Amino acid sequence: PSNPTDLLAGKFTDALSGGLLSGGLLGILENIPLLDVIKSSSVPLLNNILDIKITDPQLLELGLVQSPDGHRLYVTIPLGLTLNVNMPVVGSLLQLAVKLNITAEVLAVKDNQGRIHLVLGDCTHSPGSLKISLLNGVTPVQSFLDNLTGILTKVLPELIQGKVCPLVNGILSGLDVTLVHNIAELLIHGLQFVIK
Numbered sequence: 500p501s502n503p504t505d506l507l508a509g510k511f512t513d514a515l516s517g518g519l520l521s522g523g524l525l526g527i528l529e530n531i532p533l534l535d536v537i538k539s540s541s542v543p544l545l546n547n548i549l550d551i552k553i554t555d556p557q558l559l560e561l562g563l564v565q566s567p568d569g570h571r572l573y574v575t576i577p578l579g580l581t582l583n584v585n586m587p588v589v590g591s592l593l594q595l596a597v598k599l600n601i602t603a604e605v606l607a608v609k610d611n612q613g614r615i616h617l618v619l620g621d622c623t624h625s626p627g628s629l630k631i632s633l634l635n636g637v638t639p640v641q642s643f644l645d646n647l648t649g650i651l652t653k654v655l656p657e658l659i660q661g662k663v664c665p666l667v668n669g670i671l672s673g674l675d676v677t678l679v680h681n682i683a684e685l686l687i688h689g690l691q692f693v694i695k
């Protein structure tokens with residue numbers, strides 16, 4: 500397998516992605532109170548929205564890049580989900596496919612007792628990775644309900660990142676101490692291991 504550090508990236512992305520699902524990521528996404536965050540010239544639109552249900556939450560394969568000085572990792576956490584908008588004037592259940600990436604920077608740091616840990620630094624959604632598309636068959640939608648997509652663009656990334664970033668932090672603190680130690684030693688000495 501040499502060089503065995505080649506495997507660390509995959510192990511890290513496995514443990515993190517596993518941690519996310521073990522920690523209830525999908526249900527957490529499903530239970531965001533989107534229509535209430537949005538409620539509490541839009542009053543018409545908003546008044547014609549019976550409810551919103553979030554279904555088919557998805558975690559995609561994680562991306563990982565190591566910084567050029569070797570001290571930091573950047574994890575790309577790609578998410579998908581479907582918004583089910585009950586809006587009767589529309590004639591049908593309105594479905595929106597959502598995509599969003601969260602970027603989490605991972606750092607190594609030693610504690611007051613000398614123990615080394617992986618910790619979350621910056622954590623925030625990736626500019627321009629939010630995608631909201633109305634599911635209408637093989638024919639795309641143009642200029643229908645742009646206001647709804649606009650409000651969603653304003654609220655949805657922030658809700659999602661406010662749920663996902665704390666979850667990532669907790670997972671980091673609970674990782675396998677052996678994996679933590681090996682990766683953190685690499686990071687703290689600025690040593691490259693993630694293959695681009």
Ligand code: NA
Nearest residue numbers: 500501502503
């Ligand atoms: Na090896």
Ligand code: NA
Nearest residue numbers: 504505507508
């Ligand atoms: Na690796």
Ligand code: NA
Nearest residue numbers: 502504505692
């Ligand atoms: Na390597």
Ligand code: NA
Nearest residue numbers: 509510512513
């Ligand atoms: Na894998």
Ligand code: NA
Nearest residue numbers: 529552553554
């Ligand atoms: Na749901």
Ligand code: NA
Nearest residue numbers: 554555556557
């Ligand atoms: Na599902």
Ligand code: NA
Nearest residue numbers: 566567568569
């Ligand atoms: Na750098």
Ligand code: NA
Nearest residue numbers: 547586587588
């Ligand atoms: Na309606």
Ligand code: NA
Nearest residue numbers: 592593594634
């Ligand atoms: Na639809």
Ligand code: NA
Nearest residue numbers: 623624625626
């Ligand atoms: Na951001």
Ligand code: NA
Nearest residue numbers: 598599628629
């Ligand atoms: Na995207």
